[PDB]
Design a protein around this ligand. Structure first.
Ligand SMILES: [Ca+2]
Length: 526
């Protein structure tokens, strides 16, 4: 009588832009053959979004199937996630799954619902990573594992799979650091990415005309908010001392902390390679070419892109090893593979890096699923889905969709659209988005809004400014049409829909709050 329950392998990277996902001809600035093969075997979701574009909050939305103001983790703050609330791992654990988590957590409380967990302290490190775990007595320990984080998380994950109770279906969360700042590739990949043929986005030199005034205060531009030695790997002791002031943005001269973690042999391979980029900077300053701020900005983009894409090469290696394991173990047909990035990222669009904004690059999050025989292979899905939907999807796939469990979710199961590749009748017409971390690193504003099929509508609470983009006519989001008479009735209807969604999702009046309010705190609710 019992029906087989599928294993669930959830691979989650950090800050992976959909523009670099590697699934087809137009998102492969570098070739990622294992990403491409996963897509060929499954479904890529091209209208996949987050509800709060920030690392911690996205992971909490994924765990709970609920918006940030409901799960309580609204910013990368020091208020811990309340792990006693409902979460999908606990629901699967209860339903007979063996559950494991390796890598990034950053939710400030011990993981709950995981039989096994070994997590980075915080952000994690690319080189020689530390991991925190409990001993049998319940007490915390921290151990360093030599190697490169993307490889080490994969090693521990495959080792755990081999030692699992094979009579229980597994849930395995593989939480990669990559491609998070400061984008340090594995030594074997240094020099494997040549960006000389690449061109920055058409709006790389965005002056922010026709956008809310607050955008001009953003502190996530490639041109002015990158650390020349840490983000872009320049070797200070190979820069003439007289030239150091001209290459550092004020306050952005910190050291690359990864170098202190490396062995001398590792550091030498690294600095041997980065001497080339450093000489490029020095020669470009001496020639006067990089004294043109726009030219220096493009030079910084090529360094950022090289390192960022270089990090993806080892994520592709990880996907390959994990999928090879499932293949050889004979369990690929009974495993639902989910790949996502916590959120998307700007690859120079609007002159920016990072995320946070409701703008499409960071509202999007890459999402691929594979479940052979259930999810059609090689399909691109244009259905609007969101990270609050992953928990009900997983719980439904696991057969743990009790009324008690499902009643805790604000998202909806994606299985109807993952099984068809099409948009179901009466599918949700809009999603809600809210971002809270102001004041905060990068100075993105507290802002919320909705995304429909065609429009993005947002109120910026910090600056008291409304914005509307018509994605049919302006997909690059360069023209705020909130005050254009052509959109007067559209604005009226969308504002109505925005207040309806705030009411449906139980958003408090005065959240997320303007400059006159503290960043809000919430008790978990469901
Ligand atoms: Ca992130």
């Amino acid at each position: 009588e019992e029906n087989k329950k599928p294993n669930i392998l959830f691979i989650i990277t950090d800050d992976h832009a959909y523009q670099t996902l590697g699934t087809g001809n137009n998102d492969s600035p570098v070739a990622l053959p294992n990403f491409n093969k996963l897509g060929r075997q499954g479904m890529v979701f091209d209208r996949s979004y987050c509800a709060n574009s920030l690392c911690g909050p996205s992971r909490a939305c994924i765990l709970t199937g609920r918006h940030s103001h409901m799960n309580g983790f609204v910013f990368n703050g020091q208020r811990p996630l309340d792990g006693s609330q409902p979460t999908y791992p606990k629901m699967l654990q209860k339903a007979g799954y063996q559950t494991g988590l390796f890598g990034k957590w950053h939710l400030e409380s011990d993981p709950t619902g995981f039989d096994t967990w070994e997590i980075f302290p915080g952000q994690g490190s690319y080189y020689n990573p530390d991991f925190i775990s409990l001993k049998p007595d319940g007490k915390r320990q921290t151990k360093r594992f030599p190697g490169y984080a993307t490889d080490v998380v994969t090693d521990k994950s495959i080792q755990w799979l081999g030692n699992r109770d094979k009579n229980k279906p597994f849930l395995l969360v593989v939480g990669h650091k990559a491609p998070h700042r400061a984008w340090c590739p594995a030594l074997r990949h240094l020099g494997k990415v040549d960006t000389s043929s690449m061109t920055p986005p058409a709006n790389f030199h965005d002056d922010y005309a026709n956008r809310p005034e607050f955008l001009k205060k953003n502190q996530q531009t490639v041109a002015n908010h990158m650390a020349i030695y840490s983000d872009l790997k320049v070797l200070k002791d190979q820069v003439p001392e007289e030239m150091r002031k001209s290459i550092v943005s004020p306050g952005y001269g910190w050291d690359l902390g990864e170098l202190n973690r490396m062995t001398p042999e590792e550091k030498k391979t690294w600095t041997d390679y980065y001497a080339k980029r450093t000489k490029s900077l020095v020669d470009g300053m001496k020639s006067g070419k990089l004294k043109d701020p726009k030219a220096f900005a493009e030079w910084k983009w090529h360094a950022y892109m090289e390192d960022y894409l270089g990090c993806l090469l080892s994520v592709d290696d990880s996907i390959g090893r994990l999928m090879e394991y499932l293949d050889k173990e004979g369990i690929a047909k009974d495993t639902l593979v989910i790949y996502c990035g916590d959120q998307g990222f700007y690859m120079g669009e609007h002159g920016m890096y990072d995320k946070r904004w409701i703008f499409e690059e960071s509202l999007r999050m890459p999402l691929i699923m594979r479940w052979p025989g259930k999810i059609p292979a090689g399909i691109r899905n244009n259905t609007m889905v969101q990270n609050i939907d992953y928990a009900p999807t997983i719980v439904s796939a696991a057969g743990a969709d009790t009324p008690e469990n499902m009643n805790t979710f604000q998202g909806v199961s994606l299985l109807p659209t993952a099984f068809t590749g099409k948009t179901p009748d009466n599918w949700r017409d809009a999603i809600y988005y809210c971002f809270y971390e102001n004041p905060g690193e990068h100075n993105a504003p507290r802002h919320d809004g909705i995304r429909t099929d065609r429009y993005t509508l947002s109120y910026i609470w910090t600056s008291d400014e409304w914005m509307l983009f018509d994605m049919k006519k302006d997909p690059m989001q360069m023209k705020n049409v909130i005050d254009d008479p052509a959109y007067k009735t559209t604005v009226e209807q969308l504002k109505k829909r925005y207040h309806e969604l705030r009411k449906t999702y139980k958003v408090p009046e005065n959240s997320p709050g303007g400059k006159g309010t503290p960043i809000p705190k919430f008790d978990a609710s469901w």
